[PDB]
Amino acid sequence: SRFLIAEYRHLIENPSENFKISVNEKDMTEWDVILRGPPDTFYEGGLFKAKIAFPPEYPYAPPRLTFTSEMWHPNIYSDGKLCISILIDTILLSVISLLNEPNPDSPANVDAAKSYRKLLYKEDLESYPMEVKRTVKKSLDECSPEDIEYFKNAAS
Numbered sequence: 001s002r003f004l005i006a007e008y009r010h011l012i013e014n015p016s017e018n019f020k021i022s023v024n025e026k027d028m029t030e031w032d033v034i035l036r037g038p039p040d041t042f043y044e045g046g047l048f049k050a051k052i053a054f055p056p057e058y059p060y061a062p063p064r065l066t067f068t069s070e071m072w073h074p075n076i077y078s079d080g081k082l083c084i085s086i087l088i089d090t091i092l093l094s095v096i097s098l099l100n101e102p103n104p105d106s107p108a109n110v111d112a113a114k115s116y117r118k119l120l121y122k123e124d125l126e127s128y129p130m131e132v133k134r135t136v137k138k139s140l141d142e143c144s145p146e147d148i149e150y151f152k153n154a155a156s
Helices: 002-013 089-099 110-120 127-141 145-150
Strands: 020-023 030-035 048-053 064-067
Touching: 002 020, 002 089, 030 089, 048 127, 110 127
Parallel strands: none
Antiparallel strands: 020 030, 030 048, 048 064
């Protein structure tokens, strides 16, 4: 519980341009994140809620990451599991980077993968982007104006 608590205080002291964290009031072993969609990508105006659940042992076991928000990405499953093994500070900023560079190896969510392939091979130029803009719109709907404040703001 001790590294956690240092990292946690570290992050609250050092607010990030592109994620808010906070402890799950109910569950100590979970942090609620919102990570902002990378600009100049389909995820442009994101704010995607998810949960980092630390197992009992943590440092020994890796933290699990699950999106609350509906996501459209080939590497995120339909339930929002994103298997960390691909690529906390670092982990979030890595996930942000992955949103815009799907990994063609593990195709967690098939529909999103097909859809991305279709964009790449110029078979369908409209779906993948619009499927993301959907999850973006939905995310802001599901986002308290307190939350929306934090971000564009801590961008100056």
